[PDB]
Structure formats: structure tokens, C-alpha cells
């Protein structure tokens, strides 16, 4: 024909290079299991031949159960997956530059060049007041050059249990946001920073974060704290100045507006002790603190070594001032001072200083850190850090070091997460299989942590919608959402399949934690299922990017994700049965 069509997996990308392989698909039916308030995703893959094809459109019926309960077609959003270019290597500028369908772009029609793949993401939101049962419906695909329409048989079962709202779970999610990057992309001026004109491009993507379970909000407290690793500079949200007497003063304006925005959006609730403010960092890159010297009237920097007399002096000034400031705002209880991977000497100097500065109630700042922990059961220092996150590449699957460490922390009421970054596999890159994200989240629970941290909400390059290639890291590493087009009406961001799979993983670990809690009798059955998870092997492509070791390892990430999900849905059904009989 002029146009071919088939249901396809959301687990991996359908790429142009796989054209000839893809044209041989003909999957016409789809079924899945969801809870009330849950979501489901699917995909239809289309193709063209010698001739191009205009105005390709897809559309969805209403969905109806056996009691004629309705889920409107408006809960089904079908979006073209837009392709963007990606250098497939890591700091390898001569690596091949290939298209990946990494963007959940727009609804409506689309043209398709000769001999091309195009795919459309399908997202189904089950309303929070939906009735249980088996729902059926269909999705149609048509075009202009086609005098016919293809048809696709979709059903799904809603189980009689309500997907927990994020605030009803104990899942920890922290994605680092870069609000100045949002300002740069959308040409927000210096003077409009953290005003309503800025907030308009932040609210949507922050709501999105909140709704998938985000609780951590990063705030920079010194300038360029990651040495400009990213496309955009990282300004400090707290401006430092040295006055004529030679003591430091701090301007909290940006920090205050940023945090207040996050309080207004419900990510943070400092009165109720919810959410975290992560202050980056007491160990910024090379210990460098840049400041305006009012005396010499110029910009200067210092680089004092942790533990040194100058260091203790300066951070004592900041921490003391910051604590008082946060106490007047009522924010102090949810505030953490962040560290990062440093020498044990630097880390101990930090924890020792921080612990030594207290308010009237002898409360000190909480402390948060990426740590490299991989073995041994000496927790005495690690327990003085209130939130830690461990890179997946430092977690040894052939041991229970990580899980034992995490379990100790849960007992003491401390937070623990894992993260992925450059060099990790599974991970959440543009070139990753999106299923890897669901796996990652399940791995956080397999390790008995509270959840997942990633550095990379929104660190856009110049024009990521067209090319995400950046000089460091696997492509797409620095962002899980895309921006909208600069002229958008409109939308302020687009989601990605990789992010939707993180979201799936999170909802699905939330189902498992909910069951464990509400059906104590199923708990060890569930725990055993979780603890059966296998870990695929990390390989590396010809150009420096981490990837799956082999086809077997790709398949395992998918099979394992689905296995566990299904297992949990069966436990779901067991609990539901119990209630009915
Ligand atoms: C939490 C997070 O994602 N942080 C980084 C992330 O960095 C990874 C890890 O957290 C770092 O400790 C490590 O940093 C350096 C390492 O400790 C040094 O011994 C070595 O000489 O240089 C390392 C820098 O490569 O780096 C790893 C990643 O390689 O990585 C992401 C990029 O995906 C961002 O840089 C986050 O800021």
C-alpha cells in the first residue's frame, strides 16, 4: 500500500535503519492491566514506500466496559513521536549522528516522506473515579493517499484498586531542575528572572515533576558549582558579596522566589515537613566560591580547602546566616546541605562543620550526598548523612552490601536512593531503550532504597528538539523532558518515552508498596518476586556510550520489567479476590 501500520512496543525505539524489518510487522490487538487512576502507554508504528504520504492521522474510540461504563476518547492522547538527531557516542565528535524518536510531540496530522518510519505514542489515563472492568475500544489510522483506514483492537482491564497519589506513598524522587536554563531557552531577561514571566515556563514542567512523585528541589548556593559542565551556566540562587569590613553577605532573592514557587506548586510543604530543599553545594567544584568584593570593587573567588581555617570561617558565616534566614521563612526543617563524591577527609570536615552549627533547639542542617558506597557494613559515618544516593555502577548485583546498607538507613528513618548517569546501563539516554527506565525504578526497590535520583530534569542544549548532541555524555543524558518550540502557544515542554517509563516504574513500585502495606499476608510473596530481579550486563558501543552488553541483555531488561509488573498485577488480583471472595 501507500501506508503500512502496526501496534509496536513502547520498550524500544523504532528506527529508520530498521525500516525493512519494521514493514513486516502486523500486530492488530493490544491488552494490558491497570488500576483506577493509573496510566497505560502503547504505540503504533507506520511506514511508507516508494511514495510519500500526507495528513496521516490516528484517532481513538471511547472505551467502554461490560457494564457500559465510559472512559472518553479524550483520556486517550495520541502524539507523534518526533525524531531528533543524536551523536551516539560519548565525547566522541566523529561518532555517527542518527535520528531517535525521543520526543512525545503533538496530536493531529503529520506528513511522512517516502520510505520512512513514523510512530505515534498512545497514552491512556484511567480516571481516578473510573469503574473497574474490561474496557474495549479501537484506534484508527488513515491518510489522504489512502482510501481506507486501518483499525486496531485495544482493550485493557481496570482493576478495582486506586493508584496511590504521590503524597500517599513513601517513594523518593529527586530530579535536578535548572530554571536558568529554562530562562535562557525562552529568552527570559535577567530582570524577569523568577517573576511571573519566568514562572510561566516553569509551572507546567514542575507540575509534571510533582505528579510523577517529585519531592526534591535543588537550589544552588554558590556560583558555577559544577564548573559549567552543562550547556548552560549554573548561576547561584544566592549571591555572595564581601563588604568593606571583609565579612560576607548573602542575597537570597532568587533562592526565595524559586523555593516559594515550589511551595506554591505543592512540591514542598515546609509546615508539614514534606519535600526536600537540596542546597548545592558545600563542596562545589574545586571548592571555589566566587563573590563580589565591594572593597576592591571587583569579582573575586576563593578556593579554601575543607577543614582549613579559612574554610571553616567562611562556611560558618554562610551556614549561620542561611539558617537564620530559613528559620524566618519557616523553611529550615526541610533544608539539606548537599555534598558530593569527595575524599573522606573533605566529607568529614563538611559533616563536622555542619553538625557543629545549630539553632536554639540544637537542630543542625540535614545533609545530603551522592556517595560511592559498594561494600562493608560500617555505617557510622554514612548514618550522619540524612539522604544519600548511590550510582548504579557502584552497586554490585552479586552481593547484598547495598541492600543491607539501605535497610539500616530505612530503620533509622534516613533516605536512600540510587541514580543513573553517563556510563550507566540500564539508564535514561536518548539512545537507551525506554524500558530501561522502568527497570531502573524497580532496581531501586530491589535494593530496598526509597527511590530514584537523577541529575537531569531539564538541562537542554541549544536546540534539543533538532539535535541533542552535547560534548559530554551519552546523548540526552542531561534532560528527561524537552522544551517546547520557542514560539509555543502553548505547551512549555514535551515528555519523552524514557521519562514515561520512569513514570511507569514509579507507579508500579507504588502498586507493590501499597499491596505490601494493605495485604500483609502477601508481603513475602511480593518481596520474593522483587528480589528475583535479574540485572542485565553493561557493555559499551564503538564510540564510548554505555549500552546493553548484548541482545540477550536488552531482552532481559524488558522481560524482567514486564515479569515483575505482571507478578504484581496478579498479587493485585489476589487481594481484590480476597475482598470479594
Ligand atoms: C548525581 C550525579 O548525577 N552527579 C553527576 C554525575 O557524576 C557521576 C558521579 O556522581 C561523580 O562523582 C563522578 O565525578 C567524578 C569522580 O568522582 C572523580 O573521581 C573523577 O575524576 O571524575 C568524575 C567526573 O567524571 O562522575 C560520575 C559520572 O561520570 O554525572 C552526570 C553526567 O551524567 C553529571 O555530571 C552529574 O552532575
UniProtKB/TrEMBL annotation:
Glycoside hydrolase 123 catalytic domain location: 176-514
Protein residues bound to N-acetyl-D-galactosamine: 169-170, 215, 229, 421-422, 477
Pfam families per UniProt: GH123_cat (PF13320), Glyco_hydro_123_N_2 (PF22680)
InterPro entries xrefs: GH123_cat, Glyco_hydro_123_N_2
The Glycoside hydrolase 123 N-terminal domain, residue ranges: 7-142
Protein name: Uncharacterized protein
UniProt source species: Clostridium perfringens (strain ATCC 13124 / DSM 756 / JCM 1290 / NCIMB 6125 / NCTC 8237 / Type A)
